[PDB]
Ligand binder design. Structure first.
Ligand SMILES: Nc1nc2c(ncn2[C@@H]2O[C@H](COP(=O)(O)OP(=O)(O)OP(=O)(O)O)[C@@H](O)[C@H]2O)c(=O)[nH]1
Ligand SMILES: Nc1ncnc2c1ncn2[C@@H]1O[C@H](COP(=O)(O)OP(=O)(O)CP(=O)(O)O)[C@@H](O)[C@H]1O
Ligand SMILES: Nc1nc2c(ncn2[C@@H]2O[C@H](COP(=O)(O)OP(=O)(O)O)[C@@H](O)[C@H]2O)c(=O)[nH]1
Ligand SMILES: CC(=O)N1c2ccccc2CC[C@@H]1C
Ligand SMILES: [Ca+2]
Ligand SMILES: [Ca+2]
Ligand SMILES: [Ca+2]
Ligand SMILES: [Mg+2]
Ligand SMILES: [Mg+2]
Ligand SMILES: [Mg+2]
Lengths: 438, 425, 54, 352
């Protein structure tokens, strides 16, 4: 058994982490007080869930996580929430003044003073691992901590844990749920300094989560709670292989091997379905073909874009629930005759498929209804470049006027780190177009 | 714990600041003696941002009252909530400033400045984590203008990494105490361009015209004007005083509203504004057509004469937050010719469930528009009209000032207008 | 349309389908980046103080 | 008060649409870089589709279907017809064509020679024509050596297709011609066919014994007005409209335009558009697309209709600018952004 340490950075990371471990506990049968009845190995054991939880002599199952925020207000909810008994206080790190949505402030000014402290708390969780696989780092693009301090942490993690893998769950900025105007700047800054330090990253576009909540769940104005309970479902499906018995994606190394033939192009597109509102009396339970077919609809993508106009480099299908292999291939054939799937000429036109029999778990009183089967498709399409193209454009509109640049220089960043970062995205966009278009 | 230190200087400063504390003290359920008697825990959630907690569950405003004559502050201490302020936080002299910037900034004020800072230091030392400062004051007079800017220049010297916010009343000839208000105003503007992060510009002419034309008062008084600034001051500080998903921080709001260090002069606005047909409920669309209308803005600048750099609207009341979003997007998408196209999504909206006293719902407007240049244009015009003949200069040169300093203040503001002009094209 | 590497356990199973065949900075360098920007902050703050002293 | 932007100043078609939109007093034009727009008249090449549909509260419409170039490129079209089973290599209305890459750069050179050697052995008329999208540059010859040698002298992708050696000739004159039909496709993917078409006729008598001179074989509007000496003799501007061309078919061949040619054209338009519907449909997308198309057909002496090419940015006939443009607003724009007949289109119903 090999452990996985999760790192949540900033408001977005911390709240999303809040909704993931809530879900992990409901899945693995862990109670809020940290007790797990089904675990017959008291205070020990190398089970599949032990990759994410540790055990004490008193039978407590403690997450292998670390929350970090440059401001205590958001993490303070965790210390007094329902799951306050899962973490010991050292796992929750907080400053006193945030980064004011300023990448420079999170990376240089305030980051320097707290980086050594974070690494040490992580060094404590690492010392408990008999074979640490890597790290899962949740954070946002727009936040000054989620962008500025993450890249600094990533840099140090590649120095103190060279051979370990690092996966990100990054939140793409969407104007519908953001009061910050400089988020483009932060996004491009953090993607530039993090790129070389992340082996695989799952972007989630808030605009996509927002619409999925309004269209499928009938939530006129969704809160972060709604967006996070949904985002954690995707996260749960993407990590299930690591926490359960199985054979596909059994450790973090398998995510790069199965989804990233080119290191820089390490941004897979996630898709999920079905998303059914619990307010509906009862719904016609979808078959394997119907939920698989839905994975090729734009409405169900974590990042809005048109996959019909790219080229796939790799592709996984993760099923949960009443699903058998015969039904999977059945739908696949039906779809390879209707859809537009253009593979790159240097990669096989194949799908790796994993099936977990336990259906998706839903939070009591939550927004999602209980389904008998569901699928999450991870596909590395050149079409996701549209995301970069949108963001890059907004960056160019402001940088042409040097708007808001002074807030960054005043924190110690040189104006050149902008154009340098931007020239790295221009390079990143080029690599996607060299791989996708004819 | 993100505490703010309030400072009000001069006659206008303290009278406006007084009603400000009278307004929010009522919103947070604090009585005239400092005892809490509200009914919602939302009143106390962020109460320590503008109030210190004493013994016996007493809340003392974190305010510092400053003036060079005792007259005004005597009135505050005997006003409605006068007793609520810290006795030691009253710092004042007896010489007065004679409505002279030079006196407030160089002679009389200089003799009293060190003691004010001694109080500010006492308030900051007790702050767990100090957000920054906010100063109410006018620019036409001598104390709030002359000594006010002197305070900022010294507060920035001791707390260089804290936010410096101000509500500044601008002088208009139609609401003038003395003819030298352009001299005092031009001198203060240069200080604020350098040593402030955000400045809410309030034109006494706009306040008057709102009281005469919109509110239908046959004879407005400084008291009438001050009620508006009270409600407007409460409006823009809602993000800070009540809980919400916004996460409002003085440095976060500055980072999101000030694309350039010198263009930090905002036009505030309030809605509704009804004459006494006053109990009529207001739909969400109506709040928004008024909030963006010039007649509800208090800088006396027609936004249709410039372009918006950034806009921050706050809504208060139990309304359809879905309807709020739709209406803001409607105003943006119907006049996108007044919002610069090179700052994506430069309009942000915040909601708050607690309405101001005596209103089902309301909206407050905070715009960083280039039309504010028209403001500084008027001042620079009134200024040169007298400085070209050296008229009234003796009041100032007698206090040690040279004509050179005036010519500099002049150029510093004409540059500020040019800067506001290139971004409008 | 081939199916390979079929693994079956109690909690699920996984397989592979093929439709068609194919055709860093050190700890010293990061401490310098950090301290370099910490210096440009000290310089700017020094020039602000000098300006205030004038 | 809807808003739109303009990113193609050389578009003769949509230039009129912008004039009618403003004439209604209900549409407002914005700078070509303002992202707060309802409608985009986009550029021809490299239209930033990825940036559309991401402005909260705005329903956005564009006048180009992403992927339509699959149908409007000489090479892409050929590859589409041969590879798509909806059309198959046995497609009856598309000339036997092949995609040929210059030898200085898949490629169907050997396949082309096989069908060429078979014809030469069978005494069949073996005249072929070479062309490309990068032309104003065409060559018609009966020798395979001249065709291939002409392509190697360039540096872009070319296509060689069987030259229709028996084109229907109008009388008097004994002259070639092609048919241009304008077809509109709205967001819902209804296929409207403008009831008015044009025939861009040749003013020179057809001559099958001299492909050197290319003025009686090419019916383009620019070649007949620059290299032809009988321009405008029989009809004004070498353009005959469906009213006159219908009478001619009745007086000569004893048949109607609807039966003899229109049915096939309506079937070619349907077949081509239905084929790529799953790939360009904006039905479940975050924005909406509509695009005007100009099909170019050939008619042979057997009254069979052949598909030449499809223009994705076509120009209209001077006489049909008003009626057509006004209809574009009716069925395409206002159908999404309503304003405060006897349609001029023939709806080609189909299964989605
Ligand atoms: N999906 C989701 N997005 C969030 C959440 N919280 C914040 N965001 C997004 O994150 C972006 C802002 O980043 P924050 O996480 O608030 O910034 P931060 O990490 O706290 O850094 P600071 O600027 O120092 O506060 C906005 O675009 C928000 O939409 C959340 O709980 N869920
Ligand atoms: N296989 C073929 N048989 C007969 N004629 C042909 C032909 N291929 C091309 N032509 C002639 O060429 C003309 C069309 O050329 P083509 O459309 O390929 O070039 P082009 O696209 O630059 C002109 P446009 O796009 O403006 O219609 C027609 O008038 C037709 O007479
Ligand atoms: N809105 C408002 N403006 C005032 C008030 N008192 C004075 N002013 C304005 O402030 C300027 C005079 O400044 P003053 O308060 O005398 O400055 P002081 O020297 O610090 O007392 C003039 O332009 C007045 O119009 C007031 O109570 N309310
Ligand atoms: C004296 C006073 O109250 N005000 C004033 C002050 C100076 C000049 C005119 C006026 C007119 C009313 C205005 C409210
Ligand atoms: Ca165990
Ligand atoms: Ca590494
Ligand atoms: Ca004295
Ligand atoms: Mg934060
Ligand atoms: Mg006075
Ligand atoms: Mg062409």
């Amino acid at each position: 058994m090999r452990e996985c340490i999760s790192i949540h950075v900033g408001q977005a990371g911390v709240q999303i982490g809040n909704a993931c471990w809530e879900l992990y506990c409901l899945e693995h049968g862990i109670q809020p007080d940290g007790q797990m009845p089904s675990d017959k190995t008291i205070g020990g054991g190398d089970d599949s869930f032990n990759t994410f939880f540790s055990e004490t002599g008193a039978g407590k199952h403690v997450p292998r996580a670390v929350f970090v925020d440059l401001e205590p207000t958001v993490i303070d909810e965790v210390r007094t929430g329902t799951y306050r008994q899962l973490f010991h206080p050292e796992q929750l790190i907080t400053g006193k003044e945030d980064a004011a949505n300023n990448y420079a402030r999170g990376h240089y000014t305030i980051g320097k003073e707290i980086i050594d402290l974070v690494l040490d708390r992580i060094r404590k969780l690492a010392d408990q691992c008999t074979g640490l696989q890597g790290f899962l780092v949740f954070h946002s693009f727009g936040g000054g901590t989620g962008s500025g301090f993450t890249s600094l942490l990533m840099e140090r993690l590649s120095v103190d844990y060279g051979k370990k893998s690092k996966l990100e769950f990054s939140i793409y900025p969407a104007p519908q749920v953001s009061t910050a105007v400089v988020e483009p700047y932060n996004s491009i800054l953090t993607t530039h300094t993090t790129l070389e330090h992340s082996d695989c990253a799952f972007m989630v576009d808030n605009e996509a989560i927002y619409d999925i909540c309004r269209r499928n769940l009938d939530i006129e104005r969704p809160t972060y709670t709604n967006l996070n309970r949904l985002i954690s479902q995707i996260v749960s499906s993407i990590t299930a292989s690591l926490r359960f018995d199985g054979a596909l994606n059994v450790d973090l190394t398998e995510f790069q091997t199965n989804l990233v033939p080119y290191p820089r192009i390490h941004f897979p597109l996630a898709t999920y379905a079905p998303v059914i509102s619990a307010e509906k009396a009862y719904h016609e339970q979808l078959s394997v073909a119907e939920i698989t077919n839905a994975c090729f609809e734009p409405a169900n993508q974590m990042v809005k874009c048109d996959p019909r106009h790219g080229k796939y480099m790799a592709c996984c299908l993760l099923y949960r629930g009443d699903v058998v292999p015969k039904d999977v291939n059945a739908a696949i054939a039906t779809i390879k005759t209707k859809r537009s799937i253009q593979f790159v000429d240097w990669c096989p036109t194949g799908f790796k498929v994993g099936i977990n029999y336990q259906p998706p778990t839903v939070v009591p009183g939550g927004d999602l209804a209980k389904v008998q089967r569901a699928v999450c498709m991870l596909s590395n399409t050149t079409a996701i470049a549209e995301a970069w193209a949108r963001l890059d454009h907004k960056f160019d509109l402001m940088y042409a006027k040097r708007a808001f640049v002074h807030w960054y220089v005043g924190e110690g960043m040189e104006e050149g780190e902008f154009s340098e970062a931007r020239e790295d995205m221009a390079a990143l966009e080029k690599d996607y177009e060299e791989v996708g278009v004819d | 714990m993100r505490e703010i230190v309030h400072i009000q200087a001069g006659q206008c400063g303290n009278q406006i600041g007084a009603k400000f504390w009278e307004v929010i003290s009522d919103e947070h359920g604090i009585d005239p003696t400092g005892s809490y008697h509200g009914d919602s825990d939302l009143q106390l959630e962020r109460i320590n941002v503008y109030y210190n907690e004493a013994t016996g569950n007493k809340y003392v405003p974190r305010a510092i009252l400053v003036d060079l004559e005792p007259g005004t502050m005597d009135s505050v201490r005997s006003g409605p909530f006068g007793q609520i302020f810290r006795p030691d936080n009253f710092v004042f002299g007896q010489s007065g400033a004679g409505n002279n910037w030079a006196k407030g900034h160089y002679t009389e004020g200089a003799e009293l400045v060190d003691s004010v800072l001694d109080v500010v230091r006492k308030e900051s030392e007790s702050c767990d984590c100090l957000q920054g400062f906010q100063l109410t004051h006018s620019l036409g007079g001598g104390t709030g203008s002359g000594m006010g800017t002197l305070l900022i220049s010294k507060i920035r010297e001791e707390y260089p990494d804290r936010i410096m916010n101000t509500f500044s009343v601008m002088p208009s000839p139609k609401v003038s105490d003395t003819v030298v208000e352009p001299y005092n105003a031009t001198l203060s503007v240069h200080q604020l361009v350098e040593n402030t992060d955000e400045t809410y510009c309030i034109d006494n002419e706009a306040l008057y015209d709102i009281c005469f034309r919109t509110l239908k008062l046959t004879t407005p008084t400084y008291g009438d004007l001050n009620h508006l600034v009270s409600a407007t001051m409460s409006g823009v500080t809602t993000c800070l005083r009540f809980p919400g998903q916004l996460n409002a921080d003085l440095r976060k709001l500055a980072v999101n509203m000030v694309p350039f260090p010198r263009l930090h002069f905002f036009m505030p606005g309030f809605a509704p504004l009804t004459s006494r047909q006053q109990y009529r409920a207001l739909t969400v669309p109506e709040l928004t057509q008024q909030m963006f209308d010039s007649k509800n803005m208090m800088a006396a600048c027609d936004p249709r004469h410039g372009r918006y750099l950034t806009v921050a609207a706050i809504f208060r009341g139990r309304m359809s937050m879905k309807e709020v979003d739709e209406q803001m997007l409607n105003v943006q998408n119907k006049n996108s010719s007044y919002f610069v196209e090179w700052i994506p999504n430069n309009v942000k909206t915040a909601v708050c469930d607690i309405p101001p006293r005596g209103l089902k719902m309301s909206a407050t407007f905070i715009g960083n528009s280039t039309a504010i240049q028209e403001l500084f244009k008027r001042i620079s015009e009134q200024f040169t009209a007298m400085f070209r003949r050296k008229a009234f200069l003796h009041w100032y040169t007698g206090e040690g000032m040279d004509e050179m300093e005036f010519t500099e203040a002049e150029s510093n503001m004409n540059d500020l207008v040019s800067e506001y002009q290139q971004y409008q094209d | 349309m081939e199916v390979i590497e079929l693994n079956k356990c109690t909690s699920g199973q996984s397989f592979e389908v093929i439709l068609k065949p194919p055709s860093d900075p050190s700890l010293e360098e990061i401490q310098k980046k950090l301290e370099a920007a910490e210096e440009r902050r000290k310089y700017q703050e020094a020039e602000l103080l000098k300006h205030l002293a004038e | 008060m809807y808003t739109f932007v303009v990113r193609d100043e050389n578009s003769s078609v949509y230039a009129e649409v912008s004039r009618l939109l403003l004439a209604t007093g209900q549409w407002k034009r914005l700078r070509k870089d303002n992202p707060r727009f309802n409608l985009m008249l986009g550029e021809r090449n490299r239209l930033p589709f990825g940036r559309l549909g991401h402005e909260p509260g705005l329903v956005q419409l564009v006048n180009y279907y992403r992927g339509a170039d699959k149908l409007c490129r000489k090479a892409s079209l050929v590859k589409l017809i041969k590879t798509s089973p909806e059309l198959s290599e046995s497609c009856t209305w598309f000339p036997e064509s092949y995609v040929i890459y210059p030898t200085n750069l898949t490629d169907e050179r050997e396949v082309f020679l096989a069908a060429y050697n078979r014809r030469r052995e069978g005494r069949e008329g073996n005249v072929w024509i070479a062309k490309s999208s990068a032309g104003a540059g065409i060559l018609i010859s009966s020798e395979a050596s001249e065709l291939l040698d002409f392509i190697d002298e360039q540096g872009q992708v070319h296509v060689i297709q069987k030259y229709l050696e028996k084109p229907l000739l109008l009388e008097p004159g004994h002259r070639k011609f092609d048919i241009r039909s304008w077809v509109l496709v709205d967001h819902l993917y209804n296929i409207y066919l403008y009831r008015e078409g044009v025939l861009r006729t040749s003013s020179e008598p057809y001559n099958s014994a001299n492909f050197q001179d290319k003025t009686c074989h090419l019916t383009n509007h620019c070649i007949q007005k620059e290299y032809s000496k009988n321009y405008g003799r029989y009809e004004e501007g070498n353009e005959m409209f469906f009213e006159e061309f219908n009478q001619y078919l009745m007086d000569a061949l004893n048949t109607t335009l609807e039966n003899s040619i229109l049915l096939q054209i309506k079937h070619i338009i349907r077949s081509c558009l239905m084929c790529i519907e799953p790939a360009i449909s904006t039905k479940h997308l975050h924005y909406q697309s509509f695009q005007l198309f100009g099909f170019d057909f050939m008619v042979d002496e057997e009254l069979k209709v052949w598909l030449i090419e499809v223009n994705g940015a076509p120009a209209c006939a001077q006489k049909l600018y008003a009626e057509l443009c006004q209809g574009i607003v009716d069925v395409a724009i206002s159908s999404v952004f309503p304003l405060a007949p006897t349609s001029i289109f023939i709806k080609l119903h189909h299964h989605h």
